[PDB]
Design a protein around this ligand. Structure first.
Ligand code: BEF
Ligand SMILES: [Mg+2]
Ligand SMILES: [Mn+2]
Length: 130
């Protein structure tokens, strides 16, 4: 998948406010192909419906948290390389390590600026040749 207008994003957070912020930013960056999920399970359901090229995900969520979601994705042969960008209020160095070691593509701390999200996405795009 390439970082073109068609790239399909899944945006995961248990609060719609954050989802709404991320969706509108993506639109601004020229990405209109964006779905939402409210937790890890909901997320995996949409993901298995196929088509997704990028995940942006919260951490603290009920049912299945973002760290578990990330690990599940990384451990599934069909989606093991799916980019996952964590966007979360968890800022302890030990949260960052756990997510990084689990295979996070990137990590943004809430609250964040439009500029930060764009810079972090582009950083991942470059890294993956998208
Ligand atoms: F709830 Be998330 F981790 F911001
Ligand atoms: Mg539902
Ligand atoms: Mn949350």
């Amino acid at each position: 998948h390439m970082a073109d207008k068609e790239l399909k994003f899944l945006v995961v957070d248990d609060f719609s406010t954050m989802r709404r912020i991320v969706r509108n930013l993506l639109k601004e960056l020229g990405f209109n192909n964006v779905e939402e999920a409210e937790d890890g399970v909901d997320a995996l359901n949409k993901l298995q419906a196929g088509g997704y090229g990028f995940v942006i995900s919260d951490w603290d969520m009920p049912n299945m948290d973002g760290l578990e979601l990330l690990k599940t994705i990384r451990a599934d042969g069909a989606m093991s390389a799916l980019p996952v960008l964590m966007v979360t209020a968890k800022a302890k160095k030990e949260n960052i390590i756990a997510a990084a070691q689990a295979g996070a593509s990137g990590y943004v701390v809430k609250p964040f600026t439009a500029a930060t999200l764009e810079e972090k996405l582009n950083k991942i795009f470059e890294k993956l040749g998208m």
